[PDB]
């Protein structure tokens, strides 16, 4: 799956592999899979683009 | 509506019964006015044949080709088409017509089709699984034999692996034999791979040379080059036609154009692939076709 | 993206209808797509299949 | 009973022409078909020619015209006529016989004769 | 008749970025107004596209692979760049294809060439030096047409060999651009279609010597190699590709 | 066994090696006519018949379909779509007497 | 047969292997080369059939 | 047999994927359902029917 903002914003994308381990494929593991190309914050925001199992993406860089 | 609702009594309010479609009035066939004939005396006719594996290819185009003395002669024993009727050949105009004249004997007459199996299909001439065109095979007995034997056509008895369809193998390579190597005699004798036919006129059915010629065709891609005899029509504007364009067949109205259409381009595709346009031969004219008027009743 | 919902609506019917127009142009195993193509080629019992 | 024997090697000036024979013995030399088959010094082997009892000559794509095969049944012999010999023909020529009933293994071998091509 | 060019500098052969550049007309069809999906031999985008140099001393006529299908770019003024050389073996054991593009007409025989080791044209400080082959024996395809052809020009050429059939794809663009390949995207129209029906697996380029030894024009050429994949085409108004989409070069085209 | 008498086995229930019989050098002739030699080691079949004589050598190719001869007509016959390969090979060291 | 006679006259032993392919079970079967194994890969297994 | 409308759900959807799984065990009136089968033991063209 492919987690993008608008490409009148920008062109930055990031790639969930959905119930993928990282260690089989900015690599961050989620139980939705593993999502390559988000930097994990430990802020909580509003959820913009939903990646699943809590895990939310949005667009300031890509974040999770 | 009594027949649509399947009752003689009909409640009031609207009923969806037929689709009315306004059917054509004549059929216009445009055609290239190209004149020349197809030398097909030159591929069936000719003296010589070459071997199957190393089979003659000739590229036929730009000449119209007159089917009907092919499927009308009583010469050939055999004449299988596929992907296409030999009756609607004369009909239709092809692009990149292949000959491929071999002689094989009598009972590998079975092994030129697509998804045979044997030793002519793998090693020497193998056919696509979406073969189009047609296998003509006939015997050639008092041509082909010699009462002491022809030995003129041979076949490669064993390759490593399987041809791909249309692929000719005229590399005569000495192979081995297991375990040891082809170093001098000193090994294991090397084994040769192509093998002659044994000719002669007294040997029985089966066995009787048959010459082959398999003709290939590809389905309406580029501007078609080979063509049938059929005539061209005069071409109508703002009518509902059936018409034909080189092979291209359908229903529509031929209306002028404001498409700038490149001079590599001939037709155009809607998102259903069907024609939406089209360029006719001889004039070079572009023709725009809208489908005939239709809608519910 | 206030009138996602409608827009949402629109777009699903739209994008059937065009997946229903492309159904046409695959072939399910078939010599083509085409069935003029396949009415100008073939006699009756080929082409009936 | 069977054996095959070659002559016409030697060492010989480029573009002149040789003739090398292969005499069969033991065997009658109809219903077999007959080889020219050449091997070079740190190469593998290499096929020259085929002839059959028509008299048929089919040769290798690679090597057009340099040679000529000329089978002869009288006395059972094969010859070959080589012309505009070149410098890269040095090589160790070899007489083979497959039966025309079966596939083409190549039985019996000759000895092998030695052609070394020099200025 | 044959000549060593043997003035020639020793220099690596270079590297750079091909862009979005590479995409030709895969069929025959006109659209207008649409996004159309097609898998077929494509140039992937920003590849690495090999780069070689005629200067003065550059003269780079090396032995390049075919592969699947050639991408050839030409930054090209003066005219130095005439044709190309097609086969396996490239001598009279197998049957090769030639294009020439001399000061009259552009000529493509299929024949069984005696190549040279250097393939030349010359031009006298008029044309009068041609040194490609040595004898053409078994000719079976010949067709002859129209000239095809700071750098001034570029010439994008799509070379194809698929069921017997060589496609050439061509478009000339006026540049002024002084090193490197300009970036932005033009879609190669279709030049012809060859009957050849041969094995391809190498290629050579023709140049043009200036005599006034020899000395090299200022030109530089740029072979890239296709690969089968998917792009998405946009269609017009006017039935021109004006943008393209690699399907499989990153996420976001994806 | 002779001509006319040929002993067939019936080759059934096992695992049959042919790389080492095609690998086999004592063998003149491996000549197959319905298969692959290549192919055997690969395929399954459900019984093997081995039919083994000894003849002549001008008449091993009498064993062939669609070949007249006289141990074809009289002795051994083999079908127009018979699948299988001959083997055959030189025994004078061994069957051969000088009485 | 006699060992001062050429090629031709030579007693040649013929051994002609024929195949059935009824509906009877396939019991001849080609011999059944094992490689190694592979553990912890994402390998194409075939375990006796 | 409190919650039984969530584990009706529950079952629903677990019975729904195990039917959808056993389904790949019917060859539908081919020859074997194991794809490899019929690619080994037919030619392309009966395989591909
Ligand atoms: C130009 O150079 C090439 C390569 O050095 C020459 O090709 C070689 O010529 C020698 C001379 O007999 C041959 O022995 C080699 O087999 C050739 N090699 C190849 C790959 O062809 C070529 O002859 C030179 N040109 C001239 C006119 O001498
Ligand atoms: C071959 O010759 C016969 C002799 O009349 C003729 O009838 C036949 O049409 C010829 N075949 C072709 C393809 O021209
Ligand atoms: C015949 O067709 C060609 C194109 O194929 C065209 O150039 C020519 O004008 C046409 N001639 C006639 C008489 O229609
Ligand atoms: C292109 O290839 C060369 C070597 O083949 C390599 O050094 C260079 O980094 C490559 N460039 C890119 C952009 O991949
Ligand atoms: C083309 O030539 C190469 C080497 O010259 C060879 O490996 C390849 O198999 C050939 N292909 C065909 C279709 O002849
Ligand atoms: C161009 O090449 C053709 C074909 O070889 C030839 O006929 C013609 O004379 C050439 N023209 C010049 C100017 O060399
Ligand atoms: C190719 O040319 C050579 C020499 O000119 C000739 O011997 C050969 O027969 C030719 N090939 C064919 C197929 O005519
Ligand atoms: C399409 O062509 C018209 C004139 O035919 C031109 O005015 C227009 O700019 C063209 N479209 C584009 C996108 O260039």
């Known amino acids: 799956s492919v987690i993008t903002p608008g490409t009148n914003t920008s062109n930055q994308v990031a790639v969930l592999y959905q119930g993928v381990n990282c260690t089989e494929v900015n690599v961050f593991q989620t139980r939705a899979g593993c999502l390559i190309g988000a930097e994990h914050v430990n802020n909580s925001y509003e959820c913009d683009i939903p990646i699943g199992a809590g895990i939310c993406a949005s667009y300031q860089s890509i974040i999770a | 509506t009594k027949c649509t609702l399947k009752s003689f009594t009909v409640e009031k309010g609207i009923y969806q019964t037929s689709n009315f479609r306004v059917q054509p009035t004549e059929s216009i066939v445009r055609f290239p006015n190209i004149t020349n004939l197809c030398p097909f005396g030159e591929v069936f006719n000719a003296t010589r044949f070459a071997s199957v594996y190393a089979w003659n290819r000739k590229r036929i185009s730009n000449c119209v080709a007159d089917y009907s003395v092919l499927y009308n002669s009583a010469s050939f024993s055999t004449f299988k088409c596929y992907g296409v009727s030999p009756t609607k050949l004369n009909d239709l105009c092809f692009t990149n017509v292949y000959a491929d004249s071999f002689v094989i004997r009598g009972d590998e007459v079975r092994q030129i089709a697509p998804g045979q199996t044997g030793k002519i299909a793998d090693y020497n001439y193998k056919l696509p699984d979406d073969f189009t065109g047609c296998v003509i095979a006939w015997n050639s007995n008092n041509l082909d034999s010699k009462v002491g034997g022809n030995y003129n056509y041979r076949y490669r008895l064993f390759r490593k692996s399987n041809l791909k369809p249309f692929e000719r193998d005229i590399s005569t390579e000495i192979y081995q034999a297991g375990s040891t190597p082809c170093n001098g005699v000193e090994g294991f004798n090397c084994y040769f791979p192509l093998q002659s036919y044994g000719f002669q006129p007294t040997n029985g059915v089966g066995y009787q040379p048959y010459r082959v010629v398999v003709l290939s065709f590809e389905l309406l891609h580029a501007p078609a080059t080979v063509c049938g005899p059929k005539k061209s029509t005069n071409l109508v504007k703002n009518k509902c036609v059936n018409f034909n364009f080189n092979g291209l067949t359908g229903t529509g109205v031929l209306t002028e154009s404001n498409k700038k259409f490149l001079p590599f381009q001939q037709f155009g595709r809607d998102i259903a692939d069907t024609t939406d346009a089209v360029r006719d031969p001889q004039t070079l004219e572009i023709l725009d076709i809208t489908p005939c008027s239709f809608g519910g009743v | 993206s206030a009138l996602g919902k409608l827009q949402d609506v629109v777009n699903q019917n739209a994008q059937a209808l065009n997946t229903l127009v492309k159904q046409l142009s695959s072939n399910f195993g078939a010599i083509s797509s085409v069935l003029n193509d396949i009415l100008s080629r073939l006699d009756p019992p080929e082409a009936e299949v | 009973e069977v054996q095959l024997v070659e002559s016409g090697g030697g060492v010989v000036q480029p573009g002149r022409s040789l003739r090398l024979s292969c005499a069969a013995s033991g065997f009658t030399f109809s219903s077999y078909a007959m080889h020219w088959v050449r091997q070079a010094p740190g190469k593998g082997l290499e096929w020259i020619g085929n002839?059959?009892?028509?008299?048929?000559?089919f040769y290798n794509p690679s090597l057009k015209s340099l040679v000529t095969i000329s089978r002869d049944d009288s006395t059972n012999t094969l010859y070959l006529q080589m012309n505009s010999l070149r410098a890269e023909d040095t090589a160790i020529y070899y007489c083979?016989?497959?039966?025309?009933?079966?596939?083409?293994?190549?039985?019996?071998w000759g000895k092998g004769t030695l052609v070394t091509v020099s200025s | 008749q044959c000549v060593n060019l043997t003035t020639r500098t020793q220099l690596p052969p270079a590297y750079t970025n091909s862009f979005t550049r590479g995409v030709y007309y895969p069929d025959k069809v006109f659209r207008s107004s649409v996004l159309h999906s097609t898998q077929d031999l494509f140039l992937p985008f920003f590849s690495n596209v090999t780069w070689f140099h005629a200067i003065h001393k550059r003269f780079d006529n090396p032995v390049l692979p075919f592969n699947d299908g050639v991408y050839f770019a030409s930054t090209e003024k003066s005219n130095i760049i005439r044709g190309w050389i097609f086969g396996t073996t490239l001598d009279s054991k197998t049957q090769s294809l030639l294009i020439v593009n001399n000061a009259t007409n552009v000529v493509i025989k299929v024949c069984e060439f005696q190549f040279c080791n250097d393939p030349f044209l010359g031009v006298y400080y008029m044309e009068s030096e041609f040194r490609v082959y040595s004898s053409a024996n078994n000719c079976t395809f010949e067709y002859v047409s129209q000239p095809f052809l700071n750098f001034k020009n570029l010439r994008e050429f799509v070379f194809k060999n698929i069921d017997g059939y060589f496609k050439i794809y061509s478009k000339h663009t006026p540049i002024n651009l002084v090193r490197d390949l300009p970036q932005g995207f033009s879609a190669l129209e279709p030049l012809v279609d060859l009957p050849i029906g041969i094995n391809i697996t190498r290629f050579q380029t023709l140049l043009a010597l200036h005599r006034s030894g020899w000395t090299a024009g200022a030109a530089a050429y740029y072979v890239g190699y296709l690969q089968p994949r998917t792009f998405l085409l946009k269609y017009n108004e006017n039935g021109t590709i004006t943008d393209a989409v690699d399907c499989a070069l990153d996420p976001l085209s994806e | 066994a002779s001509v006319y008498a040929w002993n067939r086995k019936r080759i059934s229930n096992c695992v049959a090696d042919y790389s080492v019989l095609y690998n086999s050098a004592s063998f003149s002739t491996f000549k197959c006519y319905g298969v692959s030699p290549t192919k055997l080691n690969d395929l399954c079949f459900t019984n093997v018949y081995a039919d083994s004589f000894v003849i002549r050598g001008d008449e091993v190719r009498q064993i062939a379909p669609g070949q007249t001869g006289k141990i074809a007509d009289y002795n051994y016959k083999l079908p127009d779509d018979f699948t299988g390969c001959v083997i055959a090979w030189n025994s004078n060291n061994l069957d051969s007497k000088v009485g | 047969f006699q060992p001062t006679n050429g090629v031709g006259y030579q007693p040649y032993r013929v051994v002609v292997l024929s195949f059935e392919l009824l509906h009877a079970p396939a019991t001849v079967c080609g011999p059944k080369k094992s490689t190694n194994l592979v553990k912890n890969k994402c390998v194409n297994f075939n375990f006796n059939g | 047999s409190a919650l039984g409308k969530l584990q009706d759900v529950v079952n629903q959807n677990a019975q729904a994927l195990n039917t959808l799984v056993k389904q790949l065990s019917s060859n539908f009136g081919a020859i074997s359902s194991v794809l490899n089968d019929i690619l080994s033991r037919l030619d392309p063209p009966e395989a591909e029917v």
């Open positions: 083979a016989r497959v039966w025309l009933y079966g596939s083409g293994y190549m039985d019996v």
């Open positions: 002839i059959y009892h028509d008299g048929s000559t």
